[PDB]
PDB file of C-alpha atoms and ligand atoms in Angstrom:
ATOM      1  CA  UNK A   1       5.984  13.243 -41.428  1.00  0.00           C
ATOM      2  CA  UNK A   2       5.460  15.141 -37.938  1.00  0.00           C
ATOM      3  CA  UNK A   3       7.779  13.419 -34.932  1.00  0.00           C
ATOM      4  CA  UNK A   4       5.806  11.381 -33.002  1.00  0.00           C
ATOM      5  CA  UNK A   5       4.090  12.370 -29.960  1.00  0.00           C
ATOM      6  CA  UNK A   6       5.812  10.303 -27.433  1.00  0.00           C
ATOM      7  CA  UNK A   7       9.802   9.561 -27.913  1.00  0.00           C
ATOM      8  CA  UNK A   8      10.545   5.684 -29.766  1.00  0.00           C
ATOM      9  CA  UNK A   9      11.791   3.950 -26.780  1.00  0.00           C
ATOM     10  CA  UNK A  10       8.693   4.762 -24.288  1.00  0.00           C
ATOM     11  CA  UNK A  11       6.290   3.734 -27.082  1.00  0.00           C
ATOM     12  CA  UNK A  12       8.801   0.781 -27.448  1.00  0.00           C
ATOM     13  CA  UNK A  13       8.957  -0.348 -23.606  1.00  0.00           C
ATOM     14  CA  UNK A  14       5.229  -0.103 -23.325  1.00  0.00           C
ATOM     15  CA  UNK A  15       4.503  -2.592 -26.943  1.00  0.00           C
ATOM     16  CA  UNK A  16       7.655  -4.776 -25.042  1.00  0.00           C
ATOM     17  CA  UNK A  17       5.879  -5.764 -21.880  1.00  0.00           C
ATOM     18  CA  UNK A  18       1.635  -5.194 -24.443  1.00  0.00           C
ATOM     19  CA  UNK A  19       0.101  -8.748 -24.134  1.00  0.00           C
ATOM     20  CA  UNK A  20      -1.628  -9.108 -27.152  1.00  0.00           C
ATOM     21  CA  UNK A  21      -4.177  -6.144 -26.448  1.00  0.00           C
ATOM     22  CA  UNK A  22      -3.944  -5.104 -22.848  1.00  0.00           C
ATOM     23  CA  UNK A  23      -1.240  -4.551 -20.914  1.00  0.00           C
ATOM     24  CA  UNK A  24      -3.015  -6.899 -18.460  1.00  0.00           C
ATOM     25  CA  UNK A  25      -1.751  -7.806 -14.293  1.00  0.00           C
ATOM     26  CA  UNK A  26       0.948 -10.184 -16.424  1.00  0.00           C
ATOM     27  CA  UNK A  27       2.354  -7.551 -18.667  1.00  0.00           C
ATOM     28  CA  UNK A  28       3.153  -5.277 -15.122  1.00  0.00           C
ATOM     29  CA  UNK A  29       4.341  -8.638 -12.972  1.00  0.00           C
ATOM     30  CA  UNK A  30       7.256  -8.679 -15.425  1.00  0.00           C
ATOM     31  CA  UNK A  31       7.789  -4.681 -15.838  1.00  0.00           C
ATOM     32  CA  UNK A  32       7.800  -4.461 -12.066  1.00  0.00           C
ATOM     33  CA  UNK A  33      10.151  -6.896 -12.244  1.00  0.00           C
ATOM     34  CA  UNK A  34      12.580  -5.339 -14.892  1.00  0.00           C
ATOM     35  CA  UNK A  35      11.893  -2.483 -13.060  1.00  0.00           C
ATOM     36  CA  UNK A  36      14.108  -4.680 -10.099  1.00  0.00           C
ATOM     37  CA  UNK A  37      10.981  -4.751  -8.020  1.00  0.00           C
ATOM     38  CA  UNK A  38       8.617  -7.193  -6.636  1.00  0.00           C
ATOM     39  CA  UNK A  39       4.916  -7.336  -7.139  1.00  0.00           C
ATOM     40  CA  UNK A  40       4.093  -7.212  -3.420  1.00  0.00           C
ATOM     41  CA  UNK A  41       7.097  -4.163  -2.626  1.00  0.00           C
ATOM     42  CA  UNK A  42       5.468  -1.210  -0.670  1.00  0.00           C
ATOM     43  CA  UNK A  43       7.619   0.630  -4.361  1.00  0.00           C
ATOM     44  CA  UNK A  44       4.584  -1.235  -6.720  1.00  0.00           C
ATOM     45  CA  UNK A  45       2.668   0.629  -5.118  1.00  0.00           C
ATOM     46  CA  UNK A  46       3.598   3.930  -5.384  1.00  0.00           C
ATOM     47  CA  UNK A  47       4.624   2.682  -9.548  1.00  0.00           C
ATOM     48  CA  UNK A  48       0.688   1.946  -9.598  1.00  0.00           C
ATOM     49  CA  UNK A  49       0.047   5.194  -7.542  1.00  0.00           C
ATOM     50  CA  UNK A  50       1.687   7.150 -10.064  1.00  0.00           C
ATOM     51  CA  UNK A  51       0.131   5.509 -13.470  1.00  0.00           C
ATOM     52  CA  UNK A  52      -3.173   6.108 -11.557  1.00  0.00           C
ATOM     53  CA  UNK A  53      -4.046   2.306 -11.114  1.00  0.00           C
ATOM     54  CA  UNK A  54      -7.413   2.050  -9.234  1.00  0.00           C
ATOM     55  CA  UNK A  55      -7.504  -1.782  -9.761  1.00  0.00           C
ATOM     56  CA  UNK A  56      -3.975  -3.655  -9.926  1.00  0.00           C
ATOM     57  CA  UNK A  57      -5.306  -5.870 -12.241  1.00  0.00           C
ATOM     58  CA  UNK A  58      -7.352  -3.265 -14.092  1.00  0.00           C
ATOM     59  CA  UNK A  59      -5.440  -3.118 -17.774  1.00  0.00           C
ATOM     60  CA  UNK A  60      -3.516   0.246 -18.215  1.00  0.00           C
ATOM     61  CA  UNK A  61      -4.707   1.823 -21.195  1.00  0.00           C
ATOM     62  CA  UNK A  62      -1.813   2.853 -23.371  1.00  0.00           C
ATOM     63  CA  UNK A  63      -2.611   6.781 -23.241  1.00  0.00           C
ATOM     64  CA  UNK A  64      -2.163   6.424 -18.886  1.00  0.00           C
ATOM     65  CA  UNK A  65       1.315   4.454 -19.886  1.00  0.00           C
ATOM     66  CA  UNK A  66       3.141   7.329 -21.978  1.00  0.00           C
ATOM     67  CA  UNK A  67       1.475  10.039 -20.715  1.00  0.00           C
ATOM     68  CA  UNK A  68       2.397   9.089 -17.303  1.00  0.00           C
ATOM     69  CA  UNK A  69       5.912   8.359 -18.309  1.00  0.00           C
ATOM     70  CA  UNK A  70       6.534  11.683 -20.400  1.00  0.00           C
ATOM     71  CA  UNK A  71       5.194  13.921 -17.879  1.00  0.00           C
ATOM     72  CA  UNK A  72       8.080  12.344 -15.557  1.00  0.00           C
ATOM     73  CA  UNK A  73      10.239  12.901 -18.297  1.00  0.00           C
ATOM     74  CA  UNK A  74      11.214   9.150 -18.441  1.00  0.00           C
ATOM     75  CA  UNK A  75      11.399   7.236 -21.918  1.00  0.00           C
ATOM     76  CA  UNK A  76      13.837   3.911 -20.952  1.00  0.00           C
ATOM     77  CA  UNK A  77      13.816   1.547 -18.183  1.00  0.00           C
ATOM     78  CA  UNK A  78      16.904   3.181 -15.995  1.00  0.00           C
ATOM     79  CA  UNK A  79      14.691   6.402 -16.790  1.00  0.00           C
ATOM     80  CA  UNK A  80      12.036   4.520 -14.822  1.00  0.00           C
ATOM     81  CA  UNK A  81      14.090   3.136 -12.276  1.00  0.00           C
ATOM     82  CA  UNK A  82      15.243   6.176 -10.949  1.00  0.00           C
ATOM     83  CA  UNK A  83      12.053   7.700 -10.570  1.00  0.00           C
ATOM     84  CA  UNK A  84      11.179   4.401  -8.851  1.00  0.00           C
ATOM     85  CA  UNK A  85      13.869   4.796  -6.508  1.00  0.00           C
ATOM     86  CA  UNK A  86      12.982   8.795  -6.262  1.00  0.00           C
ATOM     87  CA  UNK A  87       9.375   7.583  -5.482  1.00  0.00           C
ATOM     88  CA  UNK A  88      10.806   4.960  -2.819  1.00  0.00           C
ATOM     89  CA  UNK A  89      12.567   7.687  -0.780  1.00  0.00           C
ATOM     90  CA  UNK A  90       9.816   9.540  -1.045  1.00  0.00           C
ATOM     91  CA  UNK A  91       8.044   6.425   0.917  1.00  0.00           C
ATOM     92  CA  UNK A  92      10.586   7.235   3.825  1.00  0.00           C
ATOM     93  CA  UNK A  93      10.418  10.515   4.222  1.00  0.00           C
ATOM     94  CA  UNK A  94       7.780  12.560   2.950  1.00  0.00           C
ATOM     95  CA  UNK A  95       4.472  11.652   6.049  1.00  0.00           C
ATOM     96  CA  UNK A  96       1.608  13.164   2.883  1.00  0.00           C
ATOM     97  CA  UNK A  97       2.919  10.764   0.896  1.00  0.00           C
ATOM     98  CA  UNK A  98       3.542   7.544   2.624  1.00  0.00           C
ATOM     99  CA  UNK A  99       0.372   8.326   4.242  1.00  0.00           C
ATOM    100  CA  UNK A 100      -1.687   8.812   0.889  1.00  0.00           C
ATOM    101  CA  UNK A 101       0.418   5.143  -0.210  1.00  0.00           C
ATOM    102  CA  UNK A 102      -1.260   3.991   2.487  1.00  0.00           C
ATOM    103  CA  UNK A 103      -4.472   4.590   2.611  1.00  0.00           C
ATOM    104  CA  UNK A 104      -4.186   4.198  -1.317  1.00  0.00           C
ATOM    105  CA  UNK A 105      -3.069   0.159  -0.558  1.00  0.00           C
ATOM    106  CA  UNK A 106      -6.059  -0.762   0.724  1.00  0.00           C
ATOM    107  CA  UNK A 107      -8.570  -0.114  -2.112  1.00  0.00           C
ATOM    108  CA  UNK A 108      -5.763  -0.976  -4.697  1.00  0.00           C
ATOM    109  CA  UNK A 109      -5.932  -4.763  -3.640  1.00  0.00           C
ATOM    110  CA  UNK A 110      -9.516  -4.395  -2.848  1.00  0.00           C
ATOM    111  CA  UNK A 111     -11.995  -7.097  -5.014  1.00  0.00           C
ATOM    112  CA  UNK A 112     -13.289  -6.111  -7.569  1.00  0.00           C
ATOM    113  CA  UNK A 113     -17.481  -7.186  -6.020  1.00  0.00           C
ATOM    114  CA  UNK A 114     -16.008  -6.833  -2.128  1.00  0.00           C
ATOM    115  CA  UNK A 115     -16.274  -4.370   0.615  1.00  0.00           C
ATOM    116  CA  UNK A 116     -12.933  -5.755   2.892  1.00  0.00           C
ATOM    117  CA  UNK A 117      -9.895  -7.308   2.199  1.00  0.00           C
ATOM    118  CA  UNK A 118      -8.180 -11.019   3.220  1.00  0.00           C
ATOM    119  CA  UNK A 119      -6.674 -10.430   6.803  1.00  0.00           C
ATOM    120  CA  UNK A 120      -4.070 -12.410   5.431  1.00  0.00           C
ATOM    121  CA  UNK A 121      -3.499  -9.913   3.150  1.00  0.00           C
ATOM    122  CA  UNK A 122      -4.255  -6.781   5.513  1.00  0.00           C
ATOM    123  CA  UNK A 123      -0.652  -8.430   7.792  1.00  0.00           C
ATOM    124  CA  UNK A 124       1.352  -8.973   4.562  1.00  0.00           C
ATOM    125  CA  UNK A 125       1.267  -5.341   3.999  1.00  0.00           C
ATOM    126  CA  UNK A 126       1.091  -4.561   7.129  1.00  0.00           C
ATOM    127  CA  UNK A 127       4.625  -5.533   8.248  1.00  0.00           C
ATOM    128  CA  UNK A 128       5.911  -3.725   5.278  1.00  0.00           C
ATOM    129  CA  UNK A 129       4.378  -0.573   6.044  1.00  0.00           C
ATOM    130  CA  UNK A 130       5.019  -0.734   9.693  1.00  0.00           C
ATOM    131  CA  UNK A 131       8.852  -0.901   9.793  1.00  0.00           C
ATOM    132  CA  UNK A 132      11.085   1.013  11.399  1.00  0.00           C
ATOM    133  CA  UNK A 133      12.708   3.101   8.347  1.00  0.00           C
ATOM    134  CA  UNK A 134       9.109   4.176   7.790  1.00  0.00           C
ATOM    135  CA  UNK A 135       7.820   7.218   9.569  1.00  0.00           C
ATOM    136  CA  UNK A 136       5.284   5.552  11.539  1.00  0.00           C
ATOM    137  CA  UNK A 137       7.063   4.597  14.912  1.00  0.00           C
ATOM    138  CA  UNK A 138       5.614   1.898  17.130  1.00  0.00           C
ATOM    139  CA  UNK A 139       6.758  -1.366  19.274  1.00  0.00           C
ATOM    140  CA  UNK A 140       7.111  -4.282  17.005  1.00  0.00           C
ATOM    141  CA  UNK A 141       5.105  -6.293  19.942  1.00  0.00           C
ATOM    142  CA  UNK A 142       2.310  -4.192  19.779  1.00  0.00           C
ATOM    143  CA  UNK A 143       2.530  -4.822  15.994  1.00  0.00           C
ATOM    144  CA  UNK A 144       2.561  -8.209  16.891  1.00  0.00           C
ATOM    145  CA  UNK A 145       0.039  -8.308  19.532  1.00  0.00           C
ATOM    146  CA  UNK A 146      -2.337  -6.827  16.434  1.00  0.00           C
ATOM    147  CA  UNK A 147      -1.671 -10.016  13.756  1.00  0.00           C
ATOM    148  CA  UNK A 148      -2.677 -12.133  17.276  1.00  0.00           C
ATOM    149  CA  UNK A 149      -5.725 -10.838  18.107  1.00  0.00           C
ATOM    150  CA  UNK A 150      -6.816 -10.432  14.805  1.00  0.00           C
ATOM    151  CA  UNK A 151      -5.909 -14.429  14.404  1.00  0.00           C
ATOM    152  CA  UNK A 152      -6.987 -14.904  17.753  1.00  0.00           C
ATOM    153  CA  UNK A 153     -10.544 -13.755  17.394  1.00  0.00           C
ATOM    154  CA  UNK A 154     -10.811 -15.024  14.228  1.00  0.00           C
ATOM    155  CA  UNK A 155     -11.377 -11.635  12.115  1.00  0.00           C
ATOM    156  CA  UNK A 156     -10.957 -12.860   8.524  1.00  0.00           C
ATOM    157  CA  UNK A 157     -11.555  -9.883   6.898  1.00  0.00           C
ATOM    158  CA  UNK A 158     -10.814  -5.978   7.274  1.00  0.00           C
ATOM    159  CA  UNK A 159     -12.711  -3.186   5.946  1.00  0.00           C
ATOM    160  CA  UNK A 160     -12.315   0.276   5.205  1.00  0.00           C
ATOM    161  CA  UNK A 161     -12.671   1.814   9.353  1.00  0.00           C
ATOM    162  CA  UNK A 162     -10.409  -0.340  10.341  1.00  0.00           C
ATOM    163  CA  UNK A 163      -7.930   0.173   7.590  1.00  0.00           C
ATOM    164  CA  UNK A 164      -7.806   3.596   7.105  1.00  0.00           C
ATOM    165  CA  UNK A 165      -8.168   4.587  11.540  1.00  0.00           C
ATOM    166  CA  UNK A 166      -5.105   1.295  12.263  1.00  0.00           C
ATOM    167  CA  UNK A 167      -1.781   3.852  11.488  1.00  0.00           C
ATOM    168  CA  UNK A 168      -4.241   6.947  13.112  1.00  0.00           C
ATOM    169  CA  UNK A 169      -4.120   4.419  16.818  1.00  0.00           C
ATOM    170  CA  UNK A 170      -1.486   3.235  16.495  1.00  0.00           C
ATOM    171  CA  UNK A 171       0.911   6.902  16.167  1.00  0.00           C
ATOM    172  CA  UNK A 172      -1.544   8.119  19.951  1.00  0.00           C
ATOM    173  CA  UNK A 173       0.336   4.698  20.478  1.00  0.00           C
ATOM    174  CA  UNK A 174       2.597   3.443  19.435  1.00  0.00           C
ATOM    175  CA  UNK A 175       2.814   1.284  23.357  1.00  0.00           C
ATOM    176  CA  UNK A 176       0.649  -1.682  24.319  1.00  0.00           C
ATOM    177  CA  UNK A 177       1.190   0.147  27.796  1.00  0.00           C
ATOM    178  CA  UNK A 178       0.072   3.438  26.842  1.00  0.00           C
ATOM    179  CA  UNK A 179      -2.852   1.357  25.699  1.00  0.00           C
ATOM    180  CA  UNK A 180      -3.405   0.205  28.761  1.00  0.00           C
ATOM    181  CA  UNK A 181      -2.576   3.379  30.817  1.00  0.00           C
ATOM    182  CA  UNK A 182      -4.780   6.336  28.366  1.00  0.00           C
ATOM    183  CA  UNK A 183      -6.869   4.592  25.080  1.00  0.00           C
ATOM    184  CA  UNK A 184     -10.821   5.973  26.499  1.00  0.00           C
ATOM    185  CA  UNK A 185     -13.235   3.414  24.940  1.00  0.00           C
ATOM    186  CA  UNK A 186     -16.221   5.982  25.171  1.00  0.00           C
ATOM    187  CA  UNK A 187     -14.176   8.016  22.141  1.00  0.00           C
ATOM    188  CA  UNK A 188     -15.934   6.444  19.660  1.00  0.00           C
ATOM    189  CA  UNK A 189     -12.783   4.514  17.811  1.00  0.00           C
ATOM    190  CA  UNK A 190     -14.092   1.757  16.095  1.00  0.00           C
ATOM    191  CA  UNK A 191     -15.585  -0.779  17.638  1.00  0.00           C
ATOM    192  CA  UNK A 192     -12.604  -3.815  16.441  1.00  0.00           C
ATOM    193  CA  UNK A 193     -10.165  -1.317  18.577  1.00  0.00           C
ATOM    194  CA  UNK A 194     -12.028  -1.320  21.641  1.00  0.00           C
ATOM    195  CA  UNK A 195     -11.557  -4.915  21.507  1.00  0.00           C
ATOM    196  CA  UNK A 196      -8.140  -5.063  21.345  1.00  0.00           C
ATOM    197  CA  UNK A 197      -7.722  -2.646  23.523  1.00  0.00           C
ATOM    198  CA  UNK A 198      -9.922  -5.525  25.667  1.00  0.00           C
ATOM    199  CA  UNK A 199      -7.882  -7.822  24.686  1.00  0.00           C
ATOM    200  CA  UNK A 200      -4.429  -6.260  25.301  1.00  0.00           C
ATOM    201  CA  UNK A 201      -6.001  -5.500  29.038  1.00  0.00           C
ATOM    202  CA  UNK A 202      -6.655  -9.122  29.730  1.00  0.00           C
ATOM    203  CA  UNK A 203      -3.314  -9.864  28.560  1.00  0.00           C
ATOM    204  CA  UNK A 204      -1.420  -7.258  31.522  1.00  0.00           C
TER     205      UNK A 204
HETATM  206 CL1  LIG B   1     -12.952   5.259   7.570  1.00  0.00          CL
HETATM  207 CL1  LIG B   2     -13.153   8.240  12.215  1.00  0.00          CL
HETATM  208 CL1  LIG B   3     -10.200  10.433   9.991  1.00  0.00          CL
HETATM  209 CL1  LIG B   4      -5.724   9.209  10.041  1.00  0.00          CL
HETATM  210 PT1  LIG B   5     -10.137   7.411  10.300  1.00  0.00          PT
END
Protein backbone atom coordinates (compact mmCIF):
# COMPACT_ATOMS: atom_id res chain seq x y z
CA UNK A 1 0.00 0.00 0.00
CA UNK A 2 1.70 3.18 -1.23
CA UNK A 3 1.91 6.25 1.02
CA UNK A 4 -0.58 9.02 0.14
CA UNK A 5 0.61 11.79 -2.18
CA UNK A 6 -0.29 14.39 0.46
CA UNK A 7 0.44 14.13 4.21
CA UNK A 8 -2.41 12.83 6.40
CA UNK A 9 -2.20 16.06 8.44
CA UNK A 10 -2.81 18.14 5.28
CA UNK A 11 -5.79 16.21 3.94
CA UNK A 12 -7.16 16.38 7.52
CA UNK A 13 -7.16 20.21 7.37
CA UNK A 14 -9.00 20.20 4.04
CA UNK A 15 -11.54 17.67 5.33
CA UNK A 16 -12.08 19.74 8.46
CA UNK A 17 -13.27 22.83 6.52
CA UNK A 18 -14.99 21.30 3.48
CA UNK A 19 -18.76 21.88 3.50
CA UNK A 20 -20.32 18.70 2.13
CA UNK A 21 -18.66 18.41 -1.33
CA UNK A 22 -17.15 21.94 -1.63
CA UNK A 23 -14.47 24.06 0.02
CA UNK A 24 -16.72 27.05 -0.47
CA UNK A 25 -16.89 30.61 0.86
CA UNK A 26 -18.01 29.39 4.28
CA UNK A 27 -15.09 26.92 4.33
CA UNK A 28 -12.72 29.77 3.44
CA UNK A 29 -14.14 32.05 6.15
CA UNK A 30 -13.70 29.40 8.87
CA UNK A 31 -10.22 28.49 7.56
CA UNK A 32 -9.12 32.18 7.48
CA UNK A 33 -10.38 32.62 11.05
CA UNK A 34 -8.39 29.60 12.24
CA UNK A 35 -5.30 31.02 10.50
CA UNK A 36 -5.76 34.12 12.73
CA UNK A 37 -7.34 36.52 10.23
CA UNK A 38 -10.61 38.05 9.00
CA UNK A 39 -12.04 37.85 5.46
CA UNK A 40 -11.53 41.59 4.88
CA UNK A 41 -7.81 41.58 5.83
CA UNK A 42 -5.11 42.31 3.25
CA UNK A 43 -3.42 39.11 4.47
CA UNK A 44 -6.51 37.23 3.18
CA UNK A 45 -5.74 38.56 -0.31
CA UNK A 46 -2.20 37.13 0.00
CA UNK A 47 -3.70 33.76 1.01
CA UNK A 48 -6.24 33.72 -1.84
CA UNK A 49 -3.46 34.69 -4.31
CA UNK A 50 -1.22 31.88 -3.01
CA UNK A 51 -4.05 29.33 -3.46
CA UNK A 52 -4.83 30.63 -6.96
CA UNK A 53 -8.33 32.04 -6.40
CA UNK A 54 -9.78 33.95 -9.35
CA UNK A 55 -13.00 34.92 -7.53
CA UNK A 56 -13.40 35.13 -3.76
CA UNK A 57 -16.57 33.01 -3.57
CA UNK A 58 -15.55 30.37 -6.14
CA UNK A 59 -15.06 26.88 -4.61
CA UNK A 60 -11.46 25.76 -4.05
CA UNK A 61 -10.73 22.38 -5.63
CA UNK A 62 -9.23 19.81 -3.28
CA UNK A 63 -6.22 19.31 -5.56
CA UNK A 64 -5.52 23.08 -5.65
CA UNK A 65 -5.62 23.35 -1.81
CA UNK A 66 -3.35 20.33 -1.33
CA UNK A 67 -0.81 20.96 -4.11
CA UNK A 68 -0.39 24.62 -3.05
CA UNK A 69 0.26 23.83 0.61
CA UNK A 70 2.48 20.86 -0.26
CA UNK A 71 4.64 23.01 -2.57
CA UNK A 72 5.05 25.50 0.31
CA UNK A 73 6.11 22.68 2.66
CA UNK A 74 3.00 23.15 4.83
CA UNK A 75 0.92 20.32 6.28
CA UNK A 76 -0.51 21.75 9.49
CA UNK A 77 -2.48 24.83 10.58
CA UNK A 78 0.65 26.13 12.35
CA UNK A 79 2.72 25.72 9.13
CA UNK A 80 0.04 27.63 7.18
CA UNK A 81 -0.01 30.37 9.83
CA UNK A 82 3.78 30.81 9.45
CA UNK A 83 3.38 30.94 5.66
CA UNK A 84 0.77 33.72 5.78
CA UNK A 85 2.83 35.64 8.34
CA UNK A 86 5.69 35.52 5.78
CA UNK A 87 3.45 36.72 2.96
CA UNK A 88 2.20 39.55 5.17
CA UNK A 89 5.80 40.68 5.77
CA UNK A 90 6.34 40.57 1.97
CA UNK A 91 3.22 42.71 1.38
CA UNK A 92 4.75 45.34 3.68
CA UNK A 93 8.30 45.21 2.26
CA UNK A 94 8.23 44.05 -1.40
CA UNK A 95 6.99 46.69 -3.86
CA UNK A 96 6.51 44.23 -6.69
CA UNK A 97 4.45 41.89 -4.49
CA UNK A 98 2.49 44.81 -3.04
CA UNK A 99 1.61 46.07 -6.55
CA UNK A 100 0.66 42.54 -7.60
CA UNK A 101 -1.67 42.05 -4.59
CA UNK A 102 -3.15 45.57 -4.97
CA UNK A 103 -4.10 44.81 -8.63
CA UNK A 104 -5.23 41.27 -7.80
CA UNK A 105 -7.68 42.59 -5.16
CA UNK A 106 -10.01 44.18 -7.72
CA UNK A 107 -10.64 41.05 -9.83
CA UNK A 108 -10.86 38.81 -6.74
CA UNK A 109 -13.73 40.79 -5.23
CA UNK A 110 -15.45 41.58 -8.53
CA UNK A 111 -18.87 40.04 -9.18
CA UNK A 112 -19.90 37.40 -11.18
CA UNK A 113 -21.37 39.45 -14.01
CA UNK A 114 -19.96 42.89 -13.25
CA UNK A 115 -17.20 44.97 -14.70
CA UNK A 116 -16.89 47.34 -11.71
CA UNK A 117 -16.80 47.03 -7.92
CA UNK A 118 -18.94 49.03 -5.48
CA UNK A 119 -17.46 52.27 -4.22
CA UNK A 120 -18.01 51.18 -0.58
CA UNK A 121 -15.91 48.06 -1.07
CA UNK A 122 -13.20 49.98 -2.97
CA UNK A 123 -12.87 52.52 -0.15
CA UNK A 124 -12.77 49.67 2.44
CA UNK A 125 -9.67 48.22 0.72
CA UNK A 126 -8.10 51.62 -0.10
CA UNK A 127 -8.21 52.53 3.61
CA UNK A 128 -6.07 49.43 4.26
CA UNK A 129 -3.67 49.60 1.29
CA UNK A 130 -2.70 53.24 1.77
CA UNK A 131 -1.79 53.02 5.48
CA UNK A 132 1.79 54.26 6.30
CA UNK A 133 3.01 50.70 6.99
CA UNK A 134 2.77 49.88 3.25
CA UNK A 135 5.20 50.88 0.44
CA UNK A 136 3.23 53.77 -1.02
CA UNK A 137 3.76 56.98 1.00
CA UNK A 138 1.07 59.69 0.77
CA UNK A 139 -0.60 62.40 2.85
CA UNK A 140 -3.75 61.31 4.74
CA UNK A 141 -5.55 64.55 3.71
CA UNK A 142 -5.22 63.49 0.04
CA UNK A 143 -6.61 59.99 0.60
CA UNK A 144 -9.47 61.53 2.58
CA UNK A 145 -10.22 64.07 -0.18
CA UNK A 146 -10.35 61.19 -2.71
CA UNK A 147 -13.00 59.37 -0.63
CA UNK A 148 -14.92 62.64 -0.15
CA UNK A 149 -14.76 63.37 -3.91
CA UNK A 150 -16.20 59.92 -4.74
CA UNK A 151 -19.02 60.37 -2.23
CA UNK A 152 -19.75 64.03 -3.08
CA UNK A 153 -19.83 63.51 -6.83
CA UNK A 154 -22.03 60.39 -6.57
CA UNK A 155 -19.35 57.97 -7.78
CA UNK A 156 -21.03 54.69 -6.81
CA UNK A 157 -18.96 52.08 -8.70
CA UNK A 158 -15.27 51.92 -9.56
CA UNK A 159 -13.72 50.51 -12.72
CA UNK A 160 -10.55 48.45 -13.16
CA UNK A 161 -8.90 51.44 -14.88
CA UNK A 162 -9.66 53.78 -11.93
CA UNK A 163 -8.44 51.12 -9.48
CA UNK A 164 -5.14 50.34 -11.18
CA UNK A 165 -4.31 53.92 -12.14
CA UNK A 166 -4.98 55.43 -8.67
CA UNK A 167 -1.94 53.58 -7.33
CA UNK A 168 0.29 55.26 -9.94
CA UNK A 169 -1.41 58.63 -9.33
CA UNK A 170 -0.85 58.63 -5.54
CA UNK A 171 2.77 57.48 -6.02
CA UNK A 172 3.40 60.29 -8.56
CA UNK A 173 1.53 63.04 -6.63
CA UNK A 174 1.47 62.11 -2.91
CA UNK A 175 0.09 65.46 -1.71
CA UNK A 176 -2.82 67.75 -2.61
CA UNK A 177 -0.36 70.63 -3.22
CA UNK A 178 1.75 68.58 -5.67
CA UNK A 179 -1.42 67.66 -7.64
CA UNK A 180 -2.52 71.31 -7.61
CA UNK A 181 0.89 72.56 -8.73
CA UNK A 182 2.01 69.85 -11.15
CA UNK A 183 -0.86 67.68 -12.53
CA UNK A 184 -1.52 68.04 -16.27
CA UNK A 185 -5.09 67.45 -17.50
CA UNK A 186 -3.73 66.96 -21.02
CA UNK A 187 -1.49 64.04 -19.91
CA UNK A 188 -4.13 61.33 -20.64
CA UNK A 189 -4.85 60.27 -17.05
CA UNK A 190 -8.31 58.75 -16.44
CA UNK A 191 -11.11 61.29 -16.79
CA UNK A 192 -12.19 60.59 -13.17
CA UNK A 193 -8.73 61.77 -12.01
CA UNK A 194 -9.08 64.94 -14.12
CA UNK A 195 -12.37 65.51 -12.25
CA UNK A 196 -10.66 64.96 -8.92
CA UNK A 197 -7.91 67.45 -9.88
CA UNK A 198 -10.56 70.09 -10.73
CA UNK A 199 -12.34 69.33 -7.42
CA UNK A 200 -9.07 69.93 -5.55
CA UNK A 201 -8.56 73.16 -7.55
CA UNK A 202 -12.01 74.35 -6.41
CA UNK A 203 -11.25 73.67 -2.73
CA UNK A 204 -8.18 75.91 -2.84
CL1 LIG B 1 -5.94 50.36 -16.61
CL1 LIG C 1 -3.10 53.78 -18.67
CL1 LIG D 1 -0.01 51.22 -17.34
CL1 LIG E 1 0.66 51.50 -12.25
PT1 LIG F 1 -2.38 52.18 -15.45
